[PDB]
Write a protein that binds this ligand. Structure first.
Ligand SMILES: Nc1ncnc2c1ncn2[C@@H]1O[C@H](COP(=O)(O)O)[C@@H](O)[C@H]1O
Ligand SMILES: Nc1ncnc2c1ncn2[C@@H]1O[C@H](COP(=O)(O)O)[C@@H](O)[C@H]1O
Ligand SMILES: Nc1ncnc2c1ncn2[C@@H]1O[C@H](COP(=O)(O)O)[C@@H](O)[C@H]1O
Ligand SMILES: Nc1ncnc2c1ncn2[C@@H]1O[C@H](COP(=O)(O)O)[C@@H](O)[C@H]1O
Lengths: 473, 431, 435, 435
């Protein structure tokens, strides 16, 4: 059983288990004290409701006394103001001892009706606002705690400890044992094909800018076309998205730190917008405030978009070619599931399995890696990456991520109000199928020859039968 | 013979013909007085150079003869003053010249009203708006796509702002099929596929776009490096790709099959074409882009080839259309001539059935001058010619396809696209 | 001999050695093709000058001898055109050259992974994380500072945004003691104190910062005059202080004790080091900054002297550390070599105990070229003048140093004040936990 | 008795006294009609509540007794509509009330012209501008600092923009001595040192600054998270530190020794004080900041104590000064009273010899209302709770104080170090002119 993060989990008196949240924070190497802060604020909130109900009882105590006086035909008295001693402290009049000793008998009936009005206007309203402030204060701390980390996640703060789950395929050696031919790197291969112009690309579009030319363009399309067919046949609905999102929409699907490191701003028509970093962002927002029955789940989407990333944190990293760029196309798996019966965890296995079958069909060797708990973002309960073999890489850098697959359970569906059926929420998952510029880098390295690049068998029909791309220089 | 716009054409005494430029300005319904301003500024410029040479000769007259202090004074006070003043008049002259539009080709219909666009030819068998044998009236593209379950404008606008959309299901696969087929179609005709940056730096965009496009058309993108613009068409980065390059006759023509998503603010078009994905802020477009020699009407022959390519494309899709000669008053400053292909939309409102799907333009050397795309003379060098033409903008082409291929039960897939969609022949209505 | 990066080094037939530049690019894991692009552009530039001078000969042959209009045409159409083409090719060559990083020093560990940073030496006696006799486990800096009542991250972030903090009470006094002691420490070594603008104009900042720093590191400040940047380190304005100056051998070296608040966006480090004041947007830093002669390996001797100063500083504080040789792939474009001092944090999570407190870099003439800090007031070499060298080294960044002190000097009852800081704290020897 | 500005004071029939508010507006030379506008809006607000409660009676009369749909209609169309109208009128009333300035204290000089600032007292023996025996004329601070070699406005403005400056050498050490001595001085009086964020979010800055400060005074800082403002004084973040807190009598007063760099656009002062570091965009300031009980004139006693602290500070430095009572028309909206300390500048132009070094203000509860700094943890008075009082007073802004020191301690050969600062300067007694 994997827990959802909600306020009840913090409440030891209501069947909750706050130590689970502390343990998740420790595995995230995050602020463990947030758990006790939420508990403290929740208790103050609940105590504040108790005070409000205590003040509200004063209303009934007054009206009952007024009612008894009217039945007994007691004169109302003059239109007197409340004594300063009463309004200095109305609480002192409503103790059991004070009432028995005749606290209200000191006031005529006109004064009792003024007192009730005063209590409503000055004390009940003040307490009602204080209840709202404390509720928001608690909820604001709760929003800072990350999703519960799944028990199968490797507990570590260093991705050197990412668990190697399995290895699939036959990675060609960097140096051919019979001819001594050393595998070239993707950028040299693509330039030797005449298919890549980083010089005009950066002149025209800024850093990391590129033009792709010729057969590499046709292979770029072939990958997209095949990926969409591949997922459509597995029941994933193809969906093409806006590449813009309004800022208020983006704030519902992304972490605030992504805004400075990752997201471009776009201005000039209507509200300022962000360019999307992944079709997962608009496809998530697509579900804003919707409700789904068990009979309507799961919902499977094959998302398609160009993706834009500022890569501010990665200056000086992967600066050669189109492995790490600001602009690339990506085919994405996106699934909404029931929150019941470990279905989202079963869907996680299905989605990483889809990506594995995809790269096996391409003849791309890879390994599946279990991402350490300290590196998960706040939404993910678990993340598997597929790291593919790059036989032209510099020593030690041969396995590089091509795919990430995450189960976010109900972390984002809560923020988007994607309800199931004290509401319950759906679960959401996402997984890369293929980001094509980096997959093209991997293909050209694994399929290179001394004369050019072989086209993977499964892509040949999607390229009009082209079997081979010959070096031009 | 079609004239290029350069400073020599303004100079009647040097073999030029400024009345050609005045007549071109009248056909554009533009500021005709700009021609006389260039002539006046050019004459003042030439006289200023003459005064400088007259001043510089004073140096030589002196040199033959404490007599050096006068000579230095002439250099420091007069020669420098005139040499800088020549630059001021030269930049001033060129600044007016840059405002004059390209010479309008003789075959362009001369008019200020696009109601007078010339209908060059009509090709195909457009289906009637209403089937005479059943009474079934063709639906509009937006209704067709929604009945297919393939279009979500509601979530699209919530997520992406005005005109935002999601496309779903078989329509997505048909969108890709159009792109995949278009690229194959042009690659087989010798057009090199090229995928471009969708960003351009502002200095680069200023070389390939008119200044008004920045306000009406181009989004700004910020956050990494210099502020940039989203491209409105792959023609913009592909043109910039040729910045300061030079080509021989043997290296021409250069033919590109450009591919990109395109982004347009459509500020001038609020309230126009507000239903569906006919006019949007974001769409994919396959573009023909060609650089030619400036000799022997080669660019005009390439113009005919390019509109012919688009015609063959829509014939292969079974899309009826007409070719339209855009009136001189509607040409932008770069274009010497523009043909549009307007396709039949049987679901359109009465009178609105033919709508632009393709524009095809010969800009001769107007943009290559600004980009320094030289042909092959010192400063008397010549420049190449550049042309561009839509092959297909896919969201609007999809609108046209579903209207022309609709039935009461769904949408037939055009025959030529079926292999590009895994063999799908028909898309059934879901609601 | 360590080479400076200039155009002459690219010209193999004219005494240069471009393979040295190619090997530096490989060690940086950077774009090697830039070297050949500069060579090609320089050759076209030199050929364009050759064509221009040959056209200029037409004047002497013709003008010495009514074909006089031809001479004007040749000047107006060909000579002017060639002159403009030379200026364009020179700028094109120089723009690519500016993209190549400084020549990496031969003693730098060659690697793309900082796991291979060379451990040069270790100094001190690091206390165990767990007391061997009592089992008391060293607390982390943030918990210590909160138990002292001296750190308010809650009000800090509400008032100042992410990573914002207030410091209160004796922790403030210790923060100040670090700054005052550091400034005295460097003054005794001949480093002149200098207080700088914390704003810099874009034109000047562009000469001392690479383009990636504008997105990852530098805040923009607006509202008076032109938009400006907050400094990330006093190294930036102190370097710019030397703009367009020339220094003779007798006027070097120039040693400055830089002091400022420093401002850093830390965009690349979202989610990293989020607890306490180890990594913040705002901190004070006492900085060693030196201008040296370019002769006789003087800047390399100064590099050793500057890391030695920082080492003696942390020895005097009783802070154990190690000196680390930063791998070539991690150096920024300006640095020819960088040593870090990584101090012991006994409260850190397992495996994270040694963390950077100091960086020390020799940038030789990479920045002085851009700032035109020339060597020699004489112009005898014309445009072949040499430039001074510049170095910088942290002495102490005080919020992170404070974190290190409180972890290393903690007891179960509070924090001992390091002996050398006690006179700077009115004799306070100990700060007691309040909760 | 000094009144707080709250809605009850506007209600003449309910124990208030609106003429007191009108007279405060007249003394401020501000908009008197705001008082009657608040009165009118409050009356309409109270009448709207009366109509709403009367409509609510329809439920009890009707609902107690198939005309049941009428009750729903009355609730859906009239009661909800009246409830919204009450909230709107309350906000409309409160928005006008926020525009009225704090009640001006009775001891404030009533005038619109600061020429009438009251001279409260003068302390010290100001040296003559011209030496009576030698005729030596006192130099101005900028010339002194340049002759010491300690001030670089040329590099300062090139690097940092207008008014930018570097300080070098012993002037830096004296700048630092002022800060360290000031912090020790206030610590002995029980003021806790506090170091603050120099950034503030817009939501918090709006609670401690009036709208005109955003255009004239506050820089905007952008690039990480939301746009923020640079602080103009540590008073701003230290006030915000108390957001939504409640303090009992036993927890007051709260005394802070604020320290920060301060940033000011000085847009209103272009062309004013353009020579040297008397008026700059960036300076360090040691600040007295106090929260007091609202009872028994305690904040007015604290005001006297705070100006007294500043006076003893400048007496210890041997700086002659005068205390000035700032005219009512010049007070900002928050201040009920403001005293300035104006020090003697013997190098100033004729007539400009006394210039502000210190401002000391009692803001009573003007800001604590906006920050919800409540008095008493008990809620026995509900929404009729009282707020604490807040005061602030400069101890020393060091660049301007340095200007005053060098003019007052100059000789023909250099500058004497004030006796009390000598231990803070390693015993340096004198700084000699270098040129
Ligand atoms: N800057 C980039 N350039 C190219 N491909 C990228 C980039 N960032 C991510 N990708 C690809 O997209 C996948 C998903 O990335 P992420 O959403 O960061 O998990 C990666 O595994 C890569 O294949
Ligand atoms: N805002 C738009 N939305 C969709 N398609 C467009 C839009 N603007 C232009 N197009 C398509 O792109 C082609 C070229 O347009 P233009 O570049 O204006 O000549 C048109 O004929 C349309 O097919
Ligand atoms: N964001 C930061 N917060 C606190 N201290 C920092 C930060 N960045 C750098 N430092 C300190 O400043 C020193 C020099 O940093 P750098 O200029 O990056 O080499 C480091 O060794 C740290 O001690
Ligand atoms: N622009 C400035 N430059 C230097 N010192 C200043 C500046 N503005 C204010 N000060 C100092 O700070 C004190 C308090 O200023 P204020 O907060 O305006 O009352 C003044 O008395 C001056 O000593």
């Amino acid at each position: 059983h994997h827990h959802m993060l909600d306020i009840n989990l913090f409440r030891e008196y209501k069947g909750g288990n706050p130590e689970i949240i502390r343990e998740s924070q420790r595995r995230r190497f995050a602020d463990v004290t947030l758990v006790d802060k939420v508990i403290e604020l929740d208790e103050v909130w609940r105590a504040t409701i108790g005070k409000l109900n205590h003040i509200k009882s004063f209303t009934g105590i007054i009206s009952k006394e007024v009612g008894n006086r009217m039945k007994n035909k007691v004169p109302l008295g003059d239109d007197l103001e409340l004594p300063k001693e009463v309004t200095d402290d109305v609480y002192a009049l409503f103790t059991k001892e004070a009432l028995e000793q005749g606290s209200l008998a000191k006031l005529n009936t006109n004064q009792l009706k003024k007192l009730s009005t005063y209590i409503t206007e000055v004390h009940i309203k003040n307490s009602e606002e204080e209840v709202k402030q404390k509720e928001k204060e608690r909820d604001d701390v709760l929003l800072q705690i990350g999703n519960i980390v799944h028990e199968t996640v490797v507990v570590s703060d260093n991705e050197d400890n990412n668990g190697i789950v399995r290895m699939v395929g036959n990675p060609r050696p960097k140096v051919d044992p019979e001819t001594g031919y050393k595998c070239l790197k993707h950028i040299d291969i693509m330039r030797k094909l005449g298919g890549l112009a980083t010089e005009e690309g950066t002149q025209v579009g800024g850093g990391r800018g590129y033009f792709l030319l010729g057969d590499l363009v046709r292979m770029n399309l072939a990958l997209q076309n095949y990926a969409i067919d591949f997922l459509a046949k597995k029941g994933y609905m193809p969906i093409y998205t806006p590449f813009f999102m309004t800022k208020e929409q983006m704030k519902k699907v992304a972490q605030l730190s992504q805004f400075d490191e990752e997201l471009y701003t776009v201005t000039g028509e209507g509200e300022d917008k962000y360019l999307i970093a992944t079709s997962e962002q608009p496809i998530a927002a697509f579900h804003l405030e919707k409700r789904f029955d068990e009979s309507e789940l799961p919902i499977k989407y094959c998302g398609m978009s160009t993706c834009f990333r500022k890569e501010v944190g990665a200056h000086g990293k992967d600066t050669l070619g189109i492995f790490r760029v600001h602009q690339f196309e990506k085919i994405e798996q996106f699934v909404v599931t029931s929150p019941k019966d470990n279905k989202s965890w079963e869907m996680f296995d299905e989605m990483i399995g889809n990506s594995e079958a995809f790269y096996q069909s391409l003849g791309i060797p890879y390994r599946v890696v279990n991402i350490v708990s300290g590196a998960l973002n706040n939404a993910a309960a678990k993340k598997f990456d597929l790291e593919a073999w790059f036989p032209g890489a510099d020593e030690g850098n041969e396995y590089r991520e091509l795919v990430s697959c995450s189960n976010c359970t109900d972390y984002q569906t809560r923020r988007l109000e994607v309800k199931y059926g004290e509401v319950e929420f759906c679960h959401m998952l996402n997984s890369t199928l293929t980001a094509t510029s980096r997959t093209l880098c991997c293909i050209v390295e694994n399929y290179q020859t001394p004369e050019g690049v072989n086209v993977p068998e499964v892509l040949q029909p999607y390229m009009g039968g082209t079997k081979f791309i010959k070096f031009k220089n």
